[PDB]
């Protein structure tokens, strides 16, 4: 395999990269030895997430000088990363040699053995034997996954073999930029988890340009390990519009109209992503493992489009209970024109004489801070909305100037785990003004913005035919603050009323993220509260808690939360006993089929004969919305 080598331009990029982070990142940090040490470890974990490749012998050879990397990045002298990447690429190959062998060996799932899915805290293997034991276990796990999939012994040995060959092929497919990226990745993600190095565009982009404006599914992908994951969906992109794939789901397989389905376990991110993308109005076939460690996969077929703005658009509806009326705005995202679209929706809402109005920001990871401000100000007359703090410690206060409220009546803002930024600042501000009730779950808590700078400076193509282009940096320039003076960072907005889901722990939120910047305050801005809704909390809670206690969906929701607690201590570990696993799957299905048919009883639908039979258009009801409509009407009555 051609040995990977830093390219000439890399030197300067490193210098330029290090400049910007060191000096201009929101976070005032010391790129000292200690900092360097942590990077080193972070890089190691990139090379070998699973700590089942590198030999402990190898590790210390590089580890003894982990404090050098500060100066190394500054002087653009990066061979330490490259030598260690070239190692651990060598060793990765040793693994695949072994693993192919073990496929041949006959295998039985009769024994009571187990598999741990998190070796991130594990010991670095000490010797050949230990490697072979760990790799034996990986192969056994893969064979079983496919047996439970429903593949035959033969095709299991064939399909695993294919994957491992591609891993070897890939090993040689990678290149200098791939290494360098990864070095930057180690540096970037040690300042905070939203700082990034974005590699330049290659030939492949050029063909995108000869190709159309513009070709994707509006999901933002990254990678932990062998497995690709979704962090973000773009509002009104087909991913989001399908409502099938979600945040956190792992992608395992992609396909086209003619061709059979293609395994993407253990890839380079670029390669998985490339396979997805297609000419507009195309289709693509997608295969996902929901959440984590479900061990069951579903298929999602994406009508490839390019974002229709009416998919992007605010959607208005009017719910009714008895004779009472509740305007509902689903606002997908904080799009330009939101506040104007909203003003027009308020027009229809006054025709219909609604007694209260829900703003539904659920799974709305933001958009324009501009629009967030405008909207806040439709419900408060004039006043500050948000405090913006920059990479100089300077504070800007963004405010509404209308001395007008376009809608005066009660207001609920409904938020969840995945509500973010503009949603959070609007939700925060509605709380701080005591102008609305918040309902749902703790919000994501992303309280910072980033920006891109190009690494290209104007003189590069007068003084070079280096035209390899340089990449960009993306990094924290601002932290957002409430008008109460708390940041939304890590805590987000905590609703007045927590729906059942929000009373537990979770995998997700800015707070659970690797090295997220900590919560803090600044001094409260000066505002004119629009009312006080603390009087109303106990009767609101009392009736809310009562209603959902008698409610089938909330009852079911509770059990699945209770069950989650009861069994979640045993998540990391899976049985390698085939029949246990098949029984786990079978017990799932029974639970599921019973729960759906129960629903259909109450909905007056004909009951399901099998779970096999669920139509692939099938949508869940919305317990939270229904209940929030109720809370909204209570609130209207209370005033």
Author numbering: 32 to 670
Provide the authors' original text about this structure.
Prc (also named Tsp) is a member of the family of C-terminal processing proteases (CTPs) which features an embedded regulatory PDZ domain inserted into a serine protease domain. In Escherichia coli, Prc is involved in degrading abnormal proteins that are unfolded or partially folded and marked cotranslationally at the C terminus by an SsrA tag and that are exported to the periplasm through the Sec translocon. By associating with its adaptor protein, NlpI, Prc is also involved in the regulated proteolysis of MepS, a lipid-anchored hydrolase specific for PG cross-links. The activity of Prc strictly requires the PDZ domain, and the PDZ deletion completely abolishes the protease activity.
We determined the structure of Prc-S452I/L252Y, which is indeed trapped in the unliganded resting state. In the structure of Prc-S452I/L252Y, the PDZ domain is docked inside the bowl, interacting with residues, mainly from NHD and CHD, dispersed across a wide region; these residues constitute a total interface area of 1,595 Å2. Interestingly, the docked PDZ domain makes little contact with the protease domain; the only contact is made between the stacking side chains of PDZ Val278 and Phe449 at the back, and this contact anchors the PDZ domain in a specific position to expose the ligand-binding strand b4. Compared to the structure of the liganded activated state, in the structure of the unliganded resting state, the docked PDZ domain is repositioned to expose its ligand-binding site for the substrate C terminus to an open space above the platform. The two-β-stranded substrate-binding hinge, which is formed in the activated state and which connects the PDZ domain to helix h9 and the platform, is unfolded into two coils; the critical substrate-sensing residues Leu245 and Leu340 are separated and become solvent exposed. Helix h9 is drifted away and partially unfolded to make up the large vaulted space above the platform. Lastly, without a folded connecting hinge, the proteolytic platform is angled down with misaligned active-site residues: the catalytic Lys477 and Ser452 are apart from each other, and the amide groups of Ala453 and Gly398, forming the oxyanion pocket, are out of place. We found that limited V8 proteolysis indeed resulted in the two fragments from Prc-S452I/L252Y but not from Prc-K477A at various incubation times, supporting the flexibility of helix h9 in the resting state. For Prc-S452I/L252Y, crystals were obtained in a solution containing 0.2 M sodium thiocyanate (pH 6.4 to 6.8) and 20% PEG 3350. The crystals of Prc-S452I/L252Y were found to be merohedrally twinned with a twinning fraction of 0.42, as determined by the Phenix tool Xtriage and as subsequently checked by the CCP4 program TRUNCATE.
